[PDB]
Design a protein around this nucleic acid. Structure first.
Length: 50
RNA sequence: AGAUGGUAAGGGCCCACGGUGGAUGCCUCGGCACCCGAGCCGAUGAAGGACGUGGCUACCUGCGAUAAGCCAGGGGGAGCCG
């Protein structure tokens, strides 16, 4: 469960990389954005052990 | 007084060359028939949909706020981000 926290973080990360854009001012478009395409998601696949 | 020619505003026929239009022929991610095979799906929420999803996205196609995708195993063997 220390898991959910890392996400809350990663979540903010993206919900930050977001406006990191908005005004076309962030040249790593894919990189740090399709980021979540795993981080925040993948490893959000927490199997309630049991 | 006598006589048969030229002139074409435009028209007619014929030849050539174009325009338009899409027959014809040749094609074919399609269709039709028949014969085999195969034959249920749903409150573990179906069939069908709405809306939303991409760094830039109108539509189509994918997916579902984990959103053109996530984990695992198997197959593959150089290109991939429809």
């Amino acid at each position: 469960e220390a898991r959910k926290l890392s996400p809350v973080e990663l979540e903010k990360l993206v919900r930050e990389k977001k406006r990191e854009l908005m005004e076309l001012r962030f040249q790593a478009s894919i990189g740090q954005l399709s980021q979540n395409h795993k981080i925040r998601d993948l490893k959000r696949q927490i199997a309630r052990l049991l």
